[PDB]
């Protein structure tokens, strides 16, 4: 469970950074 939680947390961190990037692209050419 410890190894499995550490992996899901790390996949989420990845997915967060991507979710943040993506929201910027949405915000980018929406301001156009």
């Amino acid at each position: 469970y410890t190894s499995l939680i550490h992996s899901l947390i790390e996949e989420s961190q990845n997915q967060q950074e991507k979710n943040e990037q993506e929201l910027l692209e949405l915000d980018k050419w929406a301001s156009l």
């Binding site: 410890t2 939680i5 550490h6 947390i9 989420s12 961190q13 967060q16 979710n19 943040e20 929201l23 949405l26 915000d27 929406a30």
Partner: peptide, 27 residues
């Protein structure tokens, strides 16, 4: 105004993730 909620949501995601992450440290 959905694009300000959209940013509220992504922000929640980070809140939640960091709580779990911190809880793991306790464990």
């Amino acid at each position: 105004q959905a694009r300000q909620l959209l940013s509220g949501i992504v922000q929640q995601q980070n809140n939640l993730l960091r709580a779990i992450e911190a809880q793991q440290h306790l464990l």
